Amino acid sequence: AWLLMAFTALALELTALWFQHVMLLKPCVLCIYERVALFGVLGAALIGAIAPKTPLRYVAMVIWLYSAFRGVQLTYEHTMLQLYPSPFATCDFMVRFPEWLPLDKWVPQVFVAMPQWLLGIFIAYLIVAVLVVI
Amino acid sequence: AQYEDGKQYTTLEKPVAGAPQVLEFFSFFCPHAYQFEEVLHISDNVKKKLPEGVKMTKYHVNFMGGDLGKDLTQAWAVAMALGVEDKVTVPLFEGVQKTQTIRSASDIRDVFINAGIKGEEYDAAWNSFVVKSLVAQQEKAAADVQLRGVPAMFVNGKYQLNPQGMDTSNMDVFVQQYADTVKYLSEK
Numbered sequence A: 001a002w003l004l005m006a007f008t009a010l011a012l013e014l015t016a017l018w019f020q021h022v023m024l025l026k027p028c029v030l031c032i033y034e035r036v037a038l039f040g041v042l043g044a045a046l047i048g049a050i051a052p053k054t055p056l057r058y059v060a061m062v063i064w065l066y067s068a069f070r071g072v073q074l075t076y077e078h079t080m081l082q083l084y085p086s087p088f089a090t091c092d093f094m095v096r097f098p099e100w101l102p103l104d105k106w107v108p109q110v111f112v113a114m115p116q117w118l119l120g121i122f123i124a125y126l127i128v129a130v131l132v133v134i
Numbered sequence B: 001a002q003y004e005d006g007k008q009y010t011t012l013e014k015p016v017a018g019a020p021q022v023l024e025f026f027s028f029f030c031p032h033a034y035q036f037e038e039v040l041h042i043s044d045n046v047k048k049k050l051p052e053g054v055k056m057t058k059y060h061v062n063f064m065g066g067d068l069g070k071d072l073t074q075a076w077a078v079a080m081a082l083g084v085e086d087k088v089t090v091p092l093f094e095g096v097q098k099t100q101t102i103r104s105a106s107d108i109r110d111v112f113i114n115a116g117i118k119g120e121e122y123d124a125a126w127n128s129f130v131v132k133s134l135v136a137q138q139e140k141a142a143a144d145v146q147l148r149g150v151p152a153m154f155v156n157g158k159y160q161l162n163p164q165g166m167d168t169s170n171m172d173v174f175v176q177q178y179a180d181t182v183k184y185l186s187e188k
């Protein structure tokens, strides 16, 4: 697993990244949230329970539980709005971590200097991720 | 028993003095804010539950629209001075979001022209201190309620608004269920 994710994880982490800055700097609040429903899982899904050892690969199935779950809707919703708006909602340009998990938005939003694919690949990288493991 | 922090309102952590009793935010770009006011008229609605002559204020904000946002704000700020608001909210929402025919200070200018505001009278105060003060009164009012998104609402500068504490399927209901939360916080 590790590689096949990392190989691709990198190749899409950076497909965002590589260009994030070349993309000049397109606005996004979903931005982080979704890029965190990424690096929050992949990084600690390679390292997760497929891990530094492979005879206990169920911590990841948990890390792949709450993983692209959000990854799904974080994009899902996000895109649900983009032509189909709704009152009980917002539109921001802001940091947040409801427990002082702070540095995370003084770096990946900071050192960053098309929904199309995301929304689908956030869910594409889900059923395939579950089927073969669970 | 039946009225909850983190549920239908959240209590502001760092609560701001000299504050407007109830105060909303919004841009002329957030399809949601557009909903909030265009579609559900929430203000008007909420206006009506409120006790006798309790100040219901409303401020516009910047992040969305870089250059224009500001002027939109400044422009707006005027309407606050002339007490014209009521007659321009709607052209402007529309002009900006729905009709997509607003691009410059004047397109806007023209809308005040259009709505019964005299081109010179609308500039007389645009550059006036009256306005400039007011702009900041906003710029700073956001900054005070540590603001991130819009639309948003805050009571006696103590209580921010959790609209998710409420129904999302029935409008008719959500609204009243909304205005309620506000009333509740106006004698707290």
Ligand SMILES: COC1=C(OC)C(=O)C(CC=C(C)C)=C(C)C1=O
Pocket: A012, A013, A015, A016, A026, A027, A028, A029, A030, A031, A032, A034, A035, A118
């Ligand atoms: C609209 O906001 C967002 C972006 O736009 C700048 C992104 O690039 C990205 C990341 C892009 C890729 C291709 C992973 C996310 C997650 C996002 O929410």
Ligand SMILES: [Zn+2]
Pocket: B038, B039
């Ligand atoms: Zn209507």
